Amino acid sequence: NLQKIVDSLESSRAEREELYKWFHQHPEMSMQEHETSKRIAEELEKLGLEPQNIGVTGQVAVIKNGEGPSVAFRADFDALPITENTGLDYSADPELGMMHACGHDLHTTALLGAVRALVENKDLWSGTFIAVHQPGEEGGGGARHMVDDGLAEKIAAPDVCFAQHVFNEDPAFGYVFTPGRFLTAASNWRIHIHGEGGHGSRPHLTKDPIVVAASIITKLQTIVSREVDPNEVAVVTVGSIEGGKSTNSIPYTVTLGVNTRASNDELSEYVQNAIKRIVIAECQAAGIEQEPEFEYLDSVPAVINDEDLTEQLMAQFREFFGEDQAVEIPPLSGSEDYPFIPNAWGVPSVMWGWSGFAAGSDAPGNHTDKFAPELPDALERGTQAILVAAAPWLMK
Amino acid sequence: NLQKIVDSLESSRAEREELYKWFHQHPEMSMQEHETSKRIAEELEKLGLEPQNIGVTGQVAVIKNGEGPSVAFRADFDALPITENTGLDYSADPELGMMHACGHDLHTTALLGAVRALVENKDLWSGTFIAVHQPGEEGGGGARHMVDDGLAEKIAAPDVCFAQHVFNEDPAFGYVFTPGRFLTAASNWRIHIHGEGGHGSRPHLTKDPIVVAASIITKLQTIVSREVDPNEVAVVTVGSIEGGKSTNSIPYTVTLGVNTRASNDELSEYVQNAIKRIVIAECQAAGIEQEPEFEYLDSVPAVINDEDLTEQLMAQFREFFGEDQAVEIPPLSGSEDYPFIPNAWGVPSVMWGWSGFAAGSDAPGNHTDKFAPELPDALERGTQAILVAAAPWLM
Amino acid sequence: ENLQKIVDSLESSRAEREELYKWFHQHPEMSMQEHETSKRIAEELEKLGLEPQNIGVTGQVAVIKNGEGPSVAFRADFDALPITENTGLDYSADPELGMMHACGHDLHTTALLGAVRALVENKDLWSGTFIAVHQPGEEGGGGARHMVDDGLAEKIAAPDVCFAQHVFNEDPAFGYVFTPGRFLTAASNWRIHIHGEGGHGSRPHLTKDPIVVAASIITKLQTIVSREVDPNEVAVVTVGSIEGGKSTNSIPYTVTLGVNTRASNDELSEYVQNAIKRIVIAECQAAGIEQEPEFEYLDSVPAVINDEDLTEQLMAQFREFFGEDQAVEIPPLSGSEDYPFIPNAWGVPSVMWGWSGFAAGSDAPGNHTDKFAPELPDALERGTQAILVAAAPWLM
Amino acid sequence: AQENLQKIVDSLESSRAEREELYKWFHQHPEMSMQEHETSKRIAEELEKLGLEPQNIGVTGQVAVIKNGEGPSVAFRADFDALPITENTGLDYSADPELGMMHACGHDLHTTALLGAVRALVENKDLWSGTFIAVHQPGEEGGGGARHMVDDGLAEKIAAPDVCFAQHVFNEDPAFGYVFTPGRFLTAASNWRIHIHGEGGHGSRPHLTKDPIVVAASIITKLQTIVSREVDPNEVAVVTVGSIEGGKSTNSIPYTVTLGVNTRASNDELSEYVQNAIKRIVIAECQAAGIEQEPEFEYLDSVPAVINDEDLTEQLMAQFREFFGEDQAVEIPPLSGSEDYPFIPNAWGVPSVMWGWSGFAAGSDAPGNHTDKFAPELPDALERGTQAILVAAAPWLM
Ligand SMILES: C[C@@H](CCc1ccccc1)CCP(=O)(O)C[C@@H](CCC(N)=O)C(=O)O
Ligand SMILES: C[C@@H](CCc1ccccc1)CCP(=O)(O)C[C@@H](CCC(N)=O)C(=O)O
Ligand SMILES: C[C@@H](CCc1ccccc1)CCP(=O)(O)C[C@@H](CCC(N)=O)C(=O)O
Ligand SMILES: C[C@@H](CCc1ccccc1)CCP(=O)(O)C[C@@H](CCC(N)=O)C(=O)O
Ligand SMILES: [Zn+2]
Ligand SMILES: [Zn+2]
Ligand SMILES: [Zn+2]
Ligand SMILES: [Zn+2]
Ligand SMILES: [Zn+2]
Ligand SMILES: [Zn+2]
Ligand SMILES: [Zn+2]
Ligand SMILES: [Zn+2]
Known part of the structure; x- marks a missing residue:
């Protein structure tokens, strides 16, 4: 059933890649992501969902599919004031002096792709999935904005909450996990x-x-x-x-x-x-x-991943993707505001990383003007991760 | 003769100060002084002169008045990218992020007032006077621009060429001279x-x-x-x-x-x-x-004042203004592009300073956001100085 | 049984061993110029009926043979530092010397000589070979390499295992600390x-x-x-x-x-x-x-790397003898050591551990301060006992 | 310039060998500020050799008064401390490099110039009239040496002169010439x-x-x-x-x-x-x-900044120009160095000038003071320093 829902993504890949490119060309500053936020809402509405506008530009949609466990997944959507210098055919206009130099457009599109798969294949799962689209992650206080705008009161808690981040990592197109302190x-x-x-x-x-x-x-x-x-x-x-x-x-x-x-x-x-x-x-x-x-x-604060849940996810990813496709790494020196979300709900959480590049750690890094996750694999891997992570709850 | 042309200034004082306040509120970047250049030429034409546009925004007007010696005087007009913080009624808008923080508006109005006094009293003097309004003094290459746009060809060389600069100096409202290396x-x-x-x-x-x-x-x-x-x-x-x-x-x-x-x-x-x-x-x-x-x-290069010509002017200024009112000072640490002008003509040159403030050297200095020479005296003294320096040749 | 009796034998010589430590404390000498210290070490080995072999300029090695069985080597260094002693101890080095045992190398040396004394006075209680390695010039003097380059491995038969220890201001008070793999x-x-x-x-x-x-x-x-x-x-x-x-x-x-x-x-x-x-x-x-x-x-x-199986074995041995409280695993320290050139020359597995010389543990003055003063009797007794406890699985 | 002046200057040739040997001795015995034991002792002995009575003032300082008939009184100061610099000149009379000491400022030369001048005066009393005071000062290199002399009662122990002078050797142009600055000098x-x-x-x-x-x-x-x-x-x-x-x-x-x-x-x-x-x-x-x-x-x-008496400086400049030639004694702008010398004439309350002289054929291209290569060139550096003292004194004493 997991394999079936993953395979269903092939049908929508061309549409999903065009949606990614659209987000890539609309990079916006923390808490001012108006075109980005409006598009996310439209994409959710297109699936018959009712996105709740929380934290100014944040959007949260609940995908109901009968009784069962509930999984939340968070993806951020703000960009950075860096002039794009990728030479991608779908590059943002260098005139904007803005670029998705951290892959948030990829995170967003991954999540919208997974939401679509779940909505179109309710025969393959049971329970609840919550899509959390967060603004203002790049020191904008976006997760706090959502929490202060009543996220936990407006949206019923899930049982678990996950997030992920793309970067220039080894193994190429693989997944990386850290139990305990991650960031x-x-x-x-x-x-x-x-x-x-x-x-x-x-x-x-x-x-x-x-x-x-x-x-x-x-x-x-x-x-x-x-x-x-x-x-x-x-x-x-x-x-x-x-x-x-x-x-x-x-x-x-x-x-x-x-x-x-x-x-x-x-x-x-x-x-x-x-x-x-x-x-x-x-x-x-x-x-x-x-x-x-x-x-x-x-x-x-430093992101701390639930130890038991991280192990559960690593075992699940290794099962589905292969042992060498999901690897444990020591903590990264980066940071994230994500945990404000699961902590407001009072639920356990894991955030992991994935590689967007054939050159792995040799590729340009996040916040360079050259950061350009490679289609199709970078998008397919992020999209699949969300489904794979959710499966032990929603298809089990 | 000199005291008569100087006394004639009171009749235009009100208008001259309004003019200064106008330039003050239109500070523009070096070599991009479109509005101030335009108004300089308009003011010269108002007096019946034929201003020549030299060096992008520069303006030179020749005041011909029968045979006799020729005197050029230079005044610059560019402002600085500093937000004005003077509190003055006639302050440049702070949101412009521009200010005449070096008193170049004052230099210009002093030269426009002196040109007017000479035009309105052609019987009281004899010869030729050249007003050189120079752009881009603040590292813009303004003097060179004028030279490379054929200043020496388009305008006949005078006998002497002068300039002045206002600053926070002692004695209050007086004049300062340095023969030889000045800057x-x-x-x-x-x-x-x-x-x-x-x-x-x-x-x-x-x-x-x-x-x-x-x-x-x-x-x-x-x-x-x-x-x-x-x-x-x-x-x-x-x-x-x-x-x-x-x-x-x-x-x-x-x-x-x-x-x-x-x-x-x-x-x-x-x-x-x-x-x-x-x-x-x-x-x-x-x-x-x-x-x-x-x-x-x-x-x-360092500004060097003609030693004989400097002494001559020091004597003239002391005679007219008072002994204590025109003093010699050691060289300043500042700089100027001015001498490219006289050097293109091949003429002897002096540049001097005057104090724009009652507090003298205790007043705010050039390139502070508070630099505001004090009316009426600051404009009065710079306008008079031009005529007083011109006299030994024209009167 | 025999381990406890040999440790208990130390009690009667405690007064003499403390005076010996004070003597070394008052004769701090520069790396590779430890003339008086080296002479005294040789004299102390000779008074135990041994034949110290002068290897590595000022280095001294004694082989203690006591019948058939395995061989254990133990290394202690003996150079001091150009720091003016400021402890106020009645046995302080003369401050006029501008020299001080600010790293406890006097303590290391006295511990080793005490353990040697125990072994020679109690030959009925053990069997095999013990090798005492007294090494000069550890404070960036290349002392270990001097011993190796002067034919340590050709002159002295390899042991089965080789150990060393270092005193510092550590928690728990007077306890022992171990790190498998990278230690320094x-x-x-x-x-x-x-x-x-x-x-x-x-x-x-x-x-x-x-x-x-x-x-x-x-x-x-x-x-x-x-x-x-x-x-x-x-x-x-x-x-x-x-x-x-x-x-x-x-x-x-x-x-x-x-x-x-x-x-x-x-x-x-x-x-x-x-x-x-x-x-x-x-x-x-x-x-x-x-x-x-x-x-x-x-x-x-290079970074000191402790043999992993051997460290575990020693950890288990120390915890059994001293208490689970009293021997703990710690993350790697930022310090360094030349010790491993010695066991790597012999081609034998090695462990170096630490011990605390202070009631205040990590709140005491640290190595290389002008106040560093391991506390008698405990600091000396615990270092002396460790050598015996570590050798016991082989010699006893 | 005078005939008696020229005669006294000419007398220097008879003592040049011994004076150069003496300079070399001082050069090889460089000592720290206020600890110049051997140099002070040798200065005293050299004055005693000339039948003078040196007075030990300011720890290691020595002052000798030469009275010879009626007339004005001229004092002359020379300092004698060296520096903790390892000598690197390769001179055959170099200080031992193991000493870690060197006369890198020429104070040995100042001292020998003054002793040589005193010798010329003592040997030719027929050629002058009045009083000459030799002031040998310790501790000039920030040792407080001038202050030490003043504090040990210089002005109460030694009667004031009419004028007081000093000089300093450096790598200056013109080569082997003299330099003066009226008013602020240092x-x-x-x-x-x-x-x-x-x-x-x-x-x-x-x-x-x-x-x-x-x-x-x-x-x-x-x-x-x-x-x-x-x-x-x-x-x-x-x-x-x-x-x-x-x-x-x-x-x-x-x-x-x-x-x-x-x-x-x-x-x-x-x-x-x-x-x-x-x-x-x-x-x-x-x-x-x-x-x-x-x-x-x-x-x-x-x-404080050394300030030379303006009229006295002009007097000395005219005198040196007459004796040595106009191009040999030049006016220069103030130097950036310093000196404790003026505490001495100020204690006596008398007008003072300190001038400079060049110790090198290469002038300003030669090694500078406080380099490890500073080596004033014999014979000229010593000759010109010794002559200056006699030339300066001549308007009063001759
Ligand atoms: C998770 C990590 C991915 C990139 C990375 C990879 C390895 C090591 C450092 C950074 C950083 C994500 P980010 O979106 O850029 C978070 C931002 C802002 C976090 C914050 N709100 O403080 C940051 O400055 O760290
Ligand atoms: C002449 C002097 C008056 C202000 C002043 C007075 C005393 C000491 C320093 C500066 C400075 C005139 P300025 O318009 O500011 C000349 C500008 C630019 C000169 C240049 N083109 O290099 C400068 O940086 O020096
Ligand atoms: C083992 C360690 C104990 C002190 C310490 C404890 C914790 C953290 C750092 C140092 C230092 C031993 P040491 O005798 O001082 C070794 C010396 C010299 C080592 C060398 N030869 O490079 C050093 O600079 O590190
Ligand atoms: C007079 C001058 C000669 C060397 C020199 C020449 C030109 C420019 C600077 C220094 C320095 C004499 P000095 O013996 O070295 C005086 C010393 C000490 C003066 C003091 N007591 O502060 C100094 O540091 O300046
Ligand atoms: Zn980022
Ligand atoms: Zn990010
Ligand atoms: Zn300016
Ligand atoms: Zn200016
Ligand atoms: Zn140490
Ligand atoms: Zn040590
Ligand atoms: Zn000196
Ligand atoms: Zn000196």
């Missing part, structure tokens, strides 16, 4: 350094925030290089910097965009507090009078 | 650091150009702090930096905006070549594969 | 010489100032760990010493950096060291320095 | 040791440490912004970190790093500004690293 705790901040501007030839009459900002970025390197146990995992990335316009003037303000990662909450707070200590001291070293501003954007 | 040699560059982007959590799969750019900015300080004779004058300013968008991604490119100063041409070249050496080595340190790019914007 | 990190140690051009402090423009360059290098080296290494890996770059110049008003010619690296494996170890070279060269080039920097190799070691 | 300086106190540990466990080597590196780098950003480009400022020391084993993280720091500034206000900026930076860098212990600032020495 890292993260935060995202903007840091505003306020100096005193002036003429480029009279620096002694200024407090030069560009020199201070440079000194800060350099000193921040010492958090990971000297302050964190070498056996732990920690990252401080400064992903953006902006200040000044004219070459011959010293500006007033420099803004830094900062991202942190750590193995656990305590160490995540440690890293963030070290950042604040350094930024304050660097301003003091320069004699800057205005306190630097720390603007919080988002934070997430 | 520094300068250059302006954009430098592009090309790394390899990726995910914020996987820096090992990237070549992070923000960390490299930070390293460069810090290393560049050693040019002035270790490589230049402590007795010399050198400056390396990084006035802008831009790269990345999302906080959780590592970008591909960072652009630095860089400005140099030096007391002389050889030192100016030494500084620029040191910047290149440092940028190249910092990229190599990170294992960056792409060469960094050096994008030349502009350069000027 | 690959390391290297270098001196790096930066050659500038000196001059008068007031005329920097006539110099190439190697202090400012050295400062630049130390800062830039932080980006190896902070940016160039996988966050999930283990890597360290420590600059442990710096020296250049004498007069405040002069710009010197040379600055020397003492540098130490750690990495989880050989490939990453080589990466880190190559990255150091690339940074040092570029920073000298950034300053316009003409003379090439010099890289002076001191020592390197 | 820069205000200070010298400090700065002690950074972290928390040590094992090299592989940096998270249990506060690493002072990383902090010291960040300090040295950040200190560059004082000159590069905080000081008016038209001014003169220097911040040099001349020494750094911390740690011993490569695989440990140490507890302390010491920085040796030197400042220069055109005036007293700016000098204080720079020093206070150093303290702000050091304190903030330690706080950035979360270091609990306060860093320590250990004051060594400071001097």
